[PDB]
C-alpha cells in the first residue's frame, strides 16, 4: 500500500513561458474584393466565425507587457510586410532633378504662406531621348533650397530614392488576429483592473487574439481599445522618468481631421509603364488642414487622467501638461494617416493645462508631407500620392503616450509631455492582455500501480 | 432544440482543477497538439517545429515502453528524495502546474531511469520468451 | 525466367472488390501514404501536409487504443440507428466506397464514442492493476 511507483501522463495541462512564431489571420469579409492593401489579407488564414475562449478557473498567471515577444515580433512582421508591399511599386529615382520653385499666391490664407511651392522641372518621358517640362506642387517640408534664381531639390535626394506607393493599394488599417501554432497557447488576462504586469487571477485561453488594427500614430492612440473599468495607466517603471507611460481611456474622444483643399491628381509618364502622380492646381480656396476635438470631453478625460495619476504620485501634487520639448517633426507632432494622406498635427493646444490639488471645439493645425520615413528608418522613403478632393476622417482617441520630466527632489509638481517615437509602445496598448505559452504534455506522477514484470 | 449546446471538454481550462480531475482532459490536449515566400516559409517552419516536438515526445514515450497509451505504469520505484508528500494531498489538493514546478529539477534522471528500466525489461522478456 | 513477373498487391485497384476481400490490401496503401525557391517550397509544403495528415491519423488511432494495428476491435457497441443492414450483405456485397458514402454522416460521433470508451477503459485498467 505504502509502496508506490512512477507513472507517465501525456497531453498534460501544464505550460511554461516561451517565445515562438505566431501566424496572421483575417476576417472573411476582407476576402470580398479589397485584395490590394498594405496589410496583406489574402495571405492571412480566414478567422474562426465563432472564436472559442476557454476560461481557466482557479488559475493565476504572471503577465509582463514590457518583456513580451509578441510586440517586437508583430512590429518586425509589419515592417517586413510594408517593405514587401512597397517592393513592386514604382521606384521614384528620376524625380531627383533640380526644380525651379516659386510661391503659391492662389488665395492662400495668412497661415499657409510658403507652405506650398509651385515647382517646374524637366523629366524623362516614355522615350529616353525626349524630355518634358512639367510643373507640380510640393509642400514646404518636402523641398530644400540649394545655393537671383531659386532652386530646390527633394529632401530625400541626398539620402535615398523614394518608392511611390501604388495608388490601388489601400493604407486603411484592417482588423488582424494573431494565432499561435500547434503546441502553443495564447493566454488572455480578463481582469478589468490589470495594470499591465504582475499576477492575474481571471485568465482564459484563445487560439486567436481579438481583431487588432495596426494604426500608426504618435502622441496618441487612435481607434484603439477602451478599458472597461476606468482610465488606466501602465509603465515599466512609474518612478523612472526615462520610461514611457501608456494611458488608456475609459471612453473614446471623437476627433475630426480634415484637409479642405480640393487637390487634383496629375499623371506623368516617366517611362515605360512608369506613372508619377503629382499635385496639380488646387480648385478654389486654400486652407490649412486641421483637427477638431470636443473641449468638454477632452477636459473631462484629462481630469480623469489627472485623478488616476494622483493615485500614483500622491494626492497633493500639482499636475501640469506641456507640449513636446523638441526634436524631429515625427515625435514633436502627432503623426498619423487619414484617407491615404499623412498628417502631422501640432498638439500644443491639447497638453497646455495645470491642475491644483483641489459646444466649443478645440482646433489644432496640421501639416501634410508627401515623403515619409516611418519606423524611424533611414534610406527607405515613400512618396505618398496626392488624393483628389477634400479629405475628412473621424477617429477615436483612446490612449496617450506620455513622458515625465525629471523633477529635482520633491518639487510638489509634475509635468507630463507627449512623446513616443517607438511604434512598439503603440502596439503594446493592444497586446498587453495577451501572452504566449508552450505546452509540456509529458508529466511524471507517483501512483501505486506497478507495471507487470 | 431545447436549449442544448456543445458542453465539450476543451482546452487547458481544466488545468486549475486537481490532478485526478484534470487527468480527464489529457487526450483533448494531446489531439490539440496537432491543430491545423517570406511568411509562408515562417508558418511552415512553425508547423514543422510543432511536428518535431510532438514526434520527439512520442519517441520518448515509446522508448519507455508506453507508446499508444496516455497512462502507462512503469517499474521504476518512486524515490522519496524528490518529493515525499503523500498520495492523498497530491491527487486531490495540488494542481498539475504546481507539481511540474516542484518536480522540474529531477525530470532528466526520471527519464533516464525509465529508459534503463524499459531496456532491462525488454531484454529480460526476450530472454524469458526465447527460453520457452 | 519462365514467364514470371511481379504480381504484387499494388494501389487501390482492389477498391472495387468486396469489404473483406479489400481488407487484404490495407497495409500497402498505408505504406503508400508516405511515398517518396518558389517550386521547391511548394513541393515541400505538400510533403509536410501529407506528413501532418498521416501523423494526425496515427494520433487518432492511438487515442482510441489501436496504435500499431491495422485492425483493432473496440468496446463501443454498434448502434443500429446508423445503418442496420446485416453482416452477410456488408462484407460480401458492398464495397468500401459505398460504405463510406452511407456512413459519412455519423463519423464524428463514432470517433467521440471510441475516444470516451478508450479513456474509461484505460482508467478502469489502471485502477484494477493498482488494486493488485
Amino acid at each position, epitope marked *: 500500500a505504502e509502496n508506490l511507483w512512477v507513472t507517465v501522463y501525456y497531453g498534460v495541462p501544464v505550460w511554461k513561458d516561451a517565445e515562438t512564431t505566431l501566424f496572421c489571420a483575417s476576417d472573411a469579409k476582407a476576402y470580398e474584393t479589397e485584395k490590394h492593401n498594405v496589410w496583406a489579407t489574402h495571405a492571412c488564414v480566414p478567422t474562426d466565425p465563432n472564436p*472559442q*475562449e*476557454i*476560461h481557466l*478557473e482557479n488559475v493565476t498567471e504572471e503577465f509582463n507587457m514590457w518583456k513580451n515577444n509578441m510586440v517586437e515580433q508583430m512590429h518586425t512582421d509589419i515592417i517586413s510586410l510594408w517593405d514587401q508591399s512597397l517592393k513592386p511599386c514604382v521606384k521614384l529615382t528620376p524625380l531627383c532633378v533640380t526644380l525651379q520653385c516659386t510661391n503659391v499666391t492662389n488665395n492662400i490664407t495668412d497661415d499657409m504662406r510658403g507652405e506650398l511651392k509651385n515647382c517646374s522641372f524637366n523629366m524623362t518621358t516614355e522615350l529616353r531621348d525626349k524630355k518634358q517640362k512639367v510643373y507640380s506642387l510640393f509642400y514646404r517640408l518636402d523641398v530644400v533650397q540649394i545655393n537671383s534664381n531659386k532652386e530646390y531639390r527633394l529632401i530625400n535626394c541626398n539620402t535615398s530614392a523614394c518608392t511611390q506607393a501604388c495608388p490601388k493599394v489601400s493604407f486603411e488599417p484592417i482588423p488582424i488576429h494573431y494565432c499561435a501554432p500547434a503546441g502553443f497557447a495564447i493566454l488572455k488576462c480578463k481582469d478589468k483592473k490589470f495594470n499591465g504586469t504582475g499576477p492575474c487571477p481571471s485568465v482564459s485561453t484563445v487560439q486567436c487574439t481579438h481583431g487588432i488594427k495596426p494604426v500608426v500614430s504618435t502622441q496618441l492612440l487612435l481607434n484603439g481599445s477602451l478599458a472597461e473599468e476606468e482610465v488606466m495607466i501602465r509603465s515599466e517603471n512609474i518612478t523612472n522618468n526615462a520610461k514611457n507611460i501608456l494611458v488608456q481611456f475609459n471612453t473614446p474622444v471623437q476627433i475630426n481631421c480634415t484637409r479642405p483643399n480640393n487637390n487634383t491628381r496629375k499623371s506623368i509618364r516617366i517611362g515605360p509603364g512608369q506613372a508619377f502622380y503629382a499635385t496639380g492646381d488646387i480648385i478654389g480656396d486654400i486652407r490649412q488642414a486641421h483637427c477638431n476635438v470636443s473641449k468638454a470631453t477632452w477636459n473631462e478625460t484629462l481630469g480623469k487622467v489627472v485623478k488616476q495619476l494622483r493615485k500614483h504620485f500622491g494626492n497633493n501634487t500639482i499636475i501640469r501638461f506641456a507640449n513636446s520639448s523638441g526634436g524631429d517633426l515625427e515625435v514633436t507632432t502627432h503623426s498619423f494617416n487619414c484617407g491615404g494622406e499623412f498628417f502631422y498635427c501640432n498638439t500644443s493646444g491639447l497638453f497646455n493645462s495645470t491642475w491644483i490639488s483641489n459646444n466649443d471645439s478645440i482646433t489644432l493645425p496640421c501639416r501634410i508631407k508627401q515623403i515619409i520615413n516611418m519606423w524611424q528608418r533611414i534610406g527607405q522613403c515613400m512618396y505618398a500620392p496626392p488624393i483628389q478632393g477634400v479629405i475628412r476622417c473621424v477617429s477615436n482617441i483612446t490612449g496617450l503616450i506620455l513622458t515625465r520630466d525629471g523633477g529635482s527632489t520633491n518639487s510638489t509638481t509634475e509635468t507630463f509631455r507627449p512623446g513616443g517615437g517607438d511604434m512598439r509602445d503603440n502596439w503594446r496598448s493592444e497586446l498587453y492582455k495577451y501572452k504566449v505559452v508552450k505546452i509540456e504534455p509529458l508529466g511524471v506522477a507517483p501512483t501505486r500501480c506497478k507495471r507487470r514484470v | *432544440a*431545447v*436549449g*442544448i*449546446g*456543445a*458542453v*465539450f*471538454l*476543451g*482546452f487547458l*481550462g*481544466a488545468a486549475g*482543477s486537481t490532478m485526478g*480531475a484534470a487527468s*480527464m*482532459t489529457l487526450t483533448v490536449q494531446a489531439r490539440n497538439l496537432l491543430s491545423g515566400t517570406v511568411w509562408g516559409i515562417k508558418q511552415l517552419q512553425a508547423r514543422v517545429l510543432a511536428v518535431e516536438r510532438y514526434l520527439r515526445d512520442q519517441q520518448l514515450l515509446g522508448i519507455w515502453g508506453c507508446s499508444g497509451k496516455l497512462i502507462c505504469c512503469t517499474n521504476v520505484p518512486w524515490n522519496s528524495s524528490w518529493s515525499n508528500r503523500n498520495l492523498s494531498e497530491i491527487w486531490d489538493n495540488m494542481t498539475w502546474l504546481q507539481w511540474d514546478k516542484e518536480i522540474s529539477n529531477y525530470t532528466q534522471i526520471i527519464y533516464g531511469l525509465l529508459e534503463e528500466s524499459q531496456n532491462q525489461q525488454e531484454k529480460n522478456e526476450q530472454d524469458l520468451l526465447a527460453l520457452d | 525466367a519462365v514467364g514470371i513477373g511481379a504480381v504484387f498487391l499494388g494501389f487501390l485497384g482492389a477498391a472495387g472488390s468486396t469489404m473483406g476481400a479489400a481488407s487484404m490490401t490495407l497495409t500497402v496503401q498505408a505504406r503508400n501514404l508516405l511515398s517518396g525557391t518558389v517550386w521547391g517550397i511548394k513541393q515541400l509544403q505538400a510533403r509536410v501536409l501529407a506528413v501532418e495528415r498521416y501523423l494526425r491519423d496515427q494520433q487518432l488511432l492511438g487515442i482510441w487504443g489501436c496504435s500499431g494495428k491495422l485492425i483493432c476491435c473496440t468496446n463501443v457497441p454498434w448502434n443500429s*440507428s446508423w445503418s442496420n443492414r446485416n453482416l452477410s450483405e456488408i462484407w460480401d456485397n458492398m464495397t468500401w466506397l459505398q460504405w463510406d458514402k452511407e456512413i459519412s454522416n455519423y463519423t464524428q*460521433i463514432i470517433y*467521440g*464514442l471510441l475516444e470516451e470508451s478508450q479513456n474509461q477503459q484505460e482508467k478502469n485498467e489502471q485502477d484494477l492493476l493498482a488494486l493488485d
Partner: antibody
Amino acid sequence: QVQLEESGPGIVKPSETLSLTCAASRGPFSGGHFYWNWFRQPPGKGLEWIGGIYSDGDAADYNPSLESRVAISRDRSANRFSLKLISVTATDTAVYYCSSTYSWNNVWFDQWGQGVLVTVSS
Amino acid sequence: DIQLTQSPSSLSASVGDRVTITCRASQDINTDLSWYYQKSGEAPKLLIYRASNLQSGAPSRFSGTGSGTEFTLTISSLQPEDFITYYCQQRYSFPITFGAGTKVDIK
C-alpha cells in the same frame, strides 16, 4: 458535476415581487452552452416550466402564460442567476427549481437539485 | 402548445409485474422525447433519453419505444423502488411541456 442551490423568501405576500436566486456551476466541462432554467412544482400537481437562460447569452426564454410576469437575469462574476415573478397569486405557491442540462455528444444529461418552497399567503 | 397525455393516470400493481405507460403528443415530434422518474420529496431524474438510448446508471428493466405522437415506457419486472411517478417530456421546439404523470402504487 454541477450542484444547484436555491435561495429566496419562504413566504411572499400576494401581488408582491418574488425574487429567487440560484448558484450556477460549470463542472468539469470547460467550454460550451449551459441552459440555466427555472421551474416550479406546485403541490398536488406536476412540474411546470417557468423560463430559461443561456450561459453564453443574455437572451431569455419564458413560458407564454408567464411572459408578462416572469423575468430572469444573471451575473457571471458571482456565477448566479435570478428569477423575478411579479403579481404573485395563490397559484404561485410551488417548489421552485433551478436546473441545468448538459449537452455532451448525444447524451443530454440533466441536473435539477432540491428546490425551494415558496408559499403565497396574507 | 404541444400537449402530452399519459395513460394510465394512476396504476396499481405488485412487485415484478410488467407495466406499460403510453404518452401521446398533440403533434409530431419525431423521436425527440424522453421519460423522467420522480418520487415525492426528491427532484425528477431522467430515466430514458431520446426514447431509444438508455440513460447511464438507470436499471435495464426500463425500455423506451415509439416515435412521433406515441411513446411507450415498459417495465418488465417491477421493483419496490419502481413504485414511482413517470413523466414524458417532449424534446421538441418551444414551448417545453411535460406529461400528466403516471402513479405506480403497490396493490
